[PDB]
Amino acid sequence: NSMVVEHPEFLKAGKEPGLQIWRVEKFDLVPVPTNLYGDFFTGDAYVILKTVQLRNGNLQYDLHYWLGNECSQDESGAAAIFTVQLDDYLNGRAVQHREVQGFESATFLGYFKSGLKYKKGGVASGFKHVVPNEVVVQRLFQVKGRRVVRATEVPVSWESFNNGDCFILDLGNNIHQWCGSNSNRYERLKATQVSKGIRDNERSGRARVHVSEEGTEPEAMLQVLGPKPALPAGTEDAANRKLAKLYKVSNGAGTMSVSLVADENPFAQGALKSEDCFILDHGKDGKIFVWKGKQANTEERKAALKTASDFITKMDYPKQTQVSVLPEGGETPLFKQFFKNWRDPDQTDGLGLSYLSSHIANVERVPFDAATLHTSTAMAAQHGMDDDGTGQKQIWRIEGSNKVPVDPATYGQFYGGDSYIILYNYRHGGRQGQIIYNWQGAQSTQDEVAASAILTAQLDEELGGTPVQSRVVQGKEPAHLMSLFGGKPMIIYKGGTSREGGQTAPASTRLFQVRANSAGATRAVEVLPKAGALNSNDAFVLKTPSAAYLWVGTGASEAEKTGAQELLRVLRAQPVQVAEGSEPDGFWEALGGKAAYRTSPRLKDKKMDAHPPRLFACSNKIGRFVIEEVPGELMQEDLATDDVMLLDTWDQVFVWVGKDSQEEEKTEALTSAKRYIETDPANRDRRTPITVVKQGFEPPSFVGWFLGWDDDYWSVDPLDRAMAELAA
C-alpha cells in the first residue's frame, strides 16, 4: 500500500496550508478529529504537521512530535520515527520539534489559542478521541497559566482544588466553571475559553456552561464533590538568555561525541560547515537546536533527534528541554539571530526568506504611501511611522536642568554634546495624539542626559500622562523622528553644542553618512572620517579644508542624493559628485587610505521576515527580571491591563503599560526594556530606541501590528464581556 492512499490526510497536509494532528496508536498514525485539536492524551504521543503558505505560493512545514507525561519509551519512539520519516516524504525541508507536556514551544503553543487539554488515559488503557453522541461524563480540569493556558485533567475531588486557580467540572449536559477567590480576573477570562470549547467542540453547542466562585457552588457541584473544606493557596526566562555555545557533532552514525566550535555568541556563520551537523546549545534557557548541513551523511541527518537526546543527557539538562532540528537553508529567525549578520547567499531577490514565522504568515505586506497612511494602521506599524511628520512640534535643548527652546531656523540640526526633547503632535485616523522624543547625544554629559530623561517624564505627567514617550540615542534615530523636518534631512553632528554659551570650532576633515527611510526622508549622521565607515547603500558627504565630496554609493537612491546636497547647503560647501568604485585619489587620502567597508545590502522589505515582532510580558518581583513570550498571532486580548508588556519590533522596543499594573512596574517601564535588550542572545545594539506607550493611548505604529484591534475594547471590563455574551 502506497502511503498517499492510506494517509490521504497526509496528501492534503502536504499540499494545503492548515494544521494536521495524528495520534500514534500502536506504531500507526491515526487522525485526531478536527474539532478535538488541542485535546491530548497524557499517556500517548502525537505528531503535528503545520503547513504554512510562503507568499511566493510555496509551502513550508513544521513537524512537531509531542510526548505526554505517561508516555512509554516505545510510544515516543514511534513519534520520533514518524517525525524523521515524514520529513523524508517532504524532501528534508521540514523543521522538526520535540515537544513535552507542560513545556512545549511558543510556536507549538501558537497553533492552539483556545488552549490545550491534557487528559488522563492513553491507548494502553483503551481510550480514544470520540465525539459521536452518547456522553456520560464526570471530569475535573485544573486551568492554569496567563498567556500559555493549560487545562489539566485531575482527580474528581476537593483535594484537587485550590484558591488560586480555575476549575472546570465537566458533567456532560452541564459544564461548571469555578474560580478561586484568589484567582486573578485575567485567568478567569482564559478559563472561559476552555469551558466554551468543551461546549462547542465536544458537545456540539448543546450544553450549559454554569459559572461560579467559592461560596456560590451549585447543588450539582456539591453533590459530586461533597461539602467544601478549606482549600490551600495557588502555585505560580531570566538572565539565562544571554549566553549560548555552538558544537560540532561526530557520530549519530555510532556513539555521540562533541567539539566546542564557539564558546560565545554571536557566532560566525562560516562556523556552520555543510558536511557536518552542529548543536547550538541554549539549554540554560531551555532550548537546543540541531543544524543539519546539506552534505552531512544520511545516517547522521536521520539520527538528529537521537543526537539531541544524548546531548541533553551528557550535559545533564532537564528532560523537558526543547529540541529543534533545522535543515541547511531552512533556518528559523530565532536560530539565525545567534550569528553575526546572517546572510543567506541569494535573498535580496525573491519574496521572503529561509523561513516565514507562522504567527505573521497572515500579515498582508503594505508598502509606504504618504497619502493613504492616515488610513492604514497596518502601514503605520510596518514602517514605524505614526504619520507623515508634518504636524506641529516644539524642540528643546537641555541646559543644566532646564528646557531651552531651540532656534526655529535650526530645527533639524542636533549636536552630540547636547540632549533634546521634541514634543510632537501626530494625526492618524481622525484622531490626534502626542509623542515626546528624548534624544541623547553620544557626548552629552551624564547630568544632562539624566536631566533630559526626567524632564521628558515631567512633560508627559503634565500633558495628562498620555503622550507616547520615546528615548532615542544618537546615531539610532527611529524612522519617524527623521521625517519631522519638511523635506530637509535630520543632521547629527559628532559633538558640539548649539547652546548660546560656547560654540566651538568644527573638525578639519568631517565625514557624514546619509541614510534614507521607507518614506524617503533622510538623516545625515556625522561619523569618524575613515574609509571603514563607508556603506554601499548610502550617500556620504566628506568635508576637507581642501574641498567637499558627495560620494554616492551604488545602493543609494535619489532621496539619499538630494538629502546629501541639502546638507552641503548647510555646511556652505560646493559638492563634487563622485560615484562609488571610481573615485579621485584626493578622496582616499582625505580618509587616511583605503580599507574595506560594508557592501552587502540591507533587508528593507524583508526586515519583518528576518525579525518578526514578538510580544512579551515582563516582571520584576523577587528582585529577579523575568520575561514570558506570548505565543501565536498578536491579539489586543493578549494585552492584560495589570501588566507591562513589551512589543519588540527589531528597530524599536515598545513597552505597553496597563492602567492597572503596579507603581514600581510603571516607573521601571524604561529599565525593563533596557534589561530585555541587554539580555537578548542576539547582542542587540544598546542604543535601540525604546518607546513607552499607555493603555488606551497606543499610537498607530503600535496598534497596527494587532489585527482585530478595537478602540472600545476596554470601555467594558474584558471579563464582564466574556461572561455574558461569549458564554451563557
From Swiss-Prot:
Cysteine-cysteine disulfides: C166-C179
GO BP, sorted A to Z: actin filament capping; actin filament depolymerization; actin filament organization; actin filament polymerization; actin filament severing; actin polymerization or depolymerization; amyloid fibril formation; barbed-end actin filament capping
Binding site for Ca(2+) 8: D642, D643, E665
Binding locations of Ca(2+) 3: G164, D165, E187
Record keywords: Acetylation, Actin capping, Actin-binding, Amyloid, Amyloidosis, Calcium, Cilium biogenesis/degradation, Corneal dystrophy, Cytoplasm, Cytoskeleton, Disease variant, Disulfide bond, Metal-binding, Phosphoprotein, Repeat, Secreted, Signal
Binding site for Ca(2+) 7: N537, D538, E560
Effect on the protein of changing D165N: In AMYLD4; does not result in actin depolymerization in absence of calcium
InterPro entries: ADF-H/Gelsolin-like_dom_sf, Gelsolin-like_dom, Villin/Gelsolin
Residue numbers of Phosphothreonine PTMs: T688
Protein name as it appears in the record: Gelsolin
